[PDB]
DNA sequence: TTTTTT
């Protein structure tokens with residue numbers, strides 16, 4: 001039911017699961033975390049944690065707490 | 072058994088194990104996704120005359136790089 | 143009244159057989175404690191002690207089966223265990239114990255109160271344990287040839303005669319010694335002399351105890367040094383060549399602790415007592431995996447600078463920088479050493495040296511200056527000082543030098559650190575050290591912000 | 606893998 005808020009931020013629900021654009025995860029990670037010191041951790045997280053429903057869409061099944069805050 | 076979080080699924084484990092005792096046994100995800108005929112496997116020796124075996128806390132296998140179950 | 147039971151009781155009342163913490167049985171035979179896990183020493187004691195028993199008991203011990211019965215009784219009556227090897231300043235022999243404090247020699251019951259489970263393996267002789275003897279005059283010549291009595295070599299000679307005298311003590315030593323020198327300098331002659339001096343208390347092992355893991359499976363090379371007082375490792379390879387393994391930095395830390403974990407074959411005992419001085423003779427200086435402060439306080443080095451050469455190759459030897467003097471070689475010395483000619487004179491000299499350095503207290507100290515690998519880590523502590531709260535008021539001067547305040551702490555960004563550090567160390571020879579150092583102490587305030595928590599001492603003095 | 610261990 002919270003997608004009513006997520007759609008206000010432009011977030012999307014594809015294949016009946018909530019997903020965010022990838023570029024959004026890397027900009028949030030860069031804006032809150034230092035790339036130089038945790039690049040290996042971020043890369044391992046993304047590589048071992050990526051999910052896809054078809055040959056074109058790749059997605060993660062998680063939502064930032066900051067996204068729940070009202071815009 | 073399929074369900075969501077906080078759904079008494081782990082409670083039924085306790086109700087069954089209290090009802091059975093030592094015969095009831097737990098297992099993890101280490102053995103179901105790995106070949107049991109290769110290398111030592113204490114579980115292969117352990118299930119000897121066990122009455123029931125329960126497997127839970129399975130990580131989602133849809134993630135890329137997560138090694139799916141071996142049928 | 144069972145006769146054999148009475149014999150067992152009388153034997154037990156003499157305190158001639160004891161049970162140890164490790165489960166062994168120690169027997170007092172021929173003025174020495176002996177033990178062995180494969181031979182029946184108890185029956186030997188029973189047969190030997192028969193002369194002290196009354197005449198109606200002695201004839202009963204001639205039958206082996208009755209000796210086995212008495213052995214079974216004695217095993218049944220031993221229910222409590224005792225400690226062994228608690229006196230560090232006693233030197234046990236095959237027929238007595240020598241006191242290193244006063245110099246007296248004890249035999250019989252006087253030596254029994256010191257429960258020593260090891261010995262040199264040969265009998266003590268007071269006739270040859272004297273100062274005035276032709277062998278002593280000969281031996282002093284070799285000792286002076288190896289270590290000259292000159293002013294530049296004084297400190298090294300004192301360290302040399304401290305490490306050797308440290309081998310008579312049965313305590314734990316906190317440092318390892320390296321005998322460094324070029325070929326044909328007498329490094330092995332002192333090893334042979336010390337072996338002939340101390341007998342069974344000497345042991346030589348392989349190089350795996352400095353390179354491999356000591357606690358994977360059976361390892362007799364580490365379990366054969368239990369209760370020994372001198373351990374030698376010989377001829378480690380040169381690490382410049384490819385494929386050579388380096389010395390485990392954490393292995394030498396375990397060799398300093400009083401207890402060492404190791405297991406023999408077909409054994410369950412995993413604890414070994416550390417009483418040994420560890421000496422490695424080398425032709426190349428050692429290389430370690432990691433350098434830290436805990437490593438630098440456990441290494442000592444002794445130099446050898448005298449060359450013994452045949453007359454054919456003398457001319458080259460005088461043109462080598464690695465030598466300070468050249469002397470003619472003696473081709474008959476090794477046979478004399480192998481014949482134990484200089485045994486008791488070297489023992490007397492070792493006792494004389496022991497009275498000079500270790501009577502108040504016994505301790506060994508490291509010499510970190512000798513190793514060239516440490517020279518970087520030693521120098522940094524004298525050039526960089528850690529940031530402190532007291533340095534805040536002085537930053538008015540530090541602003542002109544390029545220092546920046548971050549989180550109310552004096553900080554210096556990476557970009558300006560390199561040219562400051564290049565004023566002391568050359569890039570080519572110390573590139574790997576400063577790279578490793580910078581990566582192991584870099585801190586970032588943000589994605590593009592860099593800073594280090596050190597300040598130079600030369601920067602707190604006004605130029 | 607094999608000495609290890611039995």
Ligand SMILES: Nc1ncnc2c1ncn2[C@@H]1O[C@H](COP(=O)(O)OP(=O)(O)OP(=O)(O)O)[C@@H](O)[C@H]1O
Pocket residue numbers: 283284285287288323324325326327328329330331332450470471472473474475476
């Ligand atoms: N004082 C001495 N006078 C004459 N010859 C001596 C003296 N001391 C030792 N030598 C002789 O020097 C020779 C070489 O010494 P030694 O083998 O101990 O040298 P080293 O430096 O330990 O050698 P390496 O490490 O290569 O085995 C020996 O044959 C020995 O007899």
Ligand SMILES: [Mg+2]
Pocket residue numbers: 326328329330331
């Ligand atoms: Mg030698």
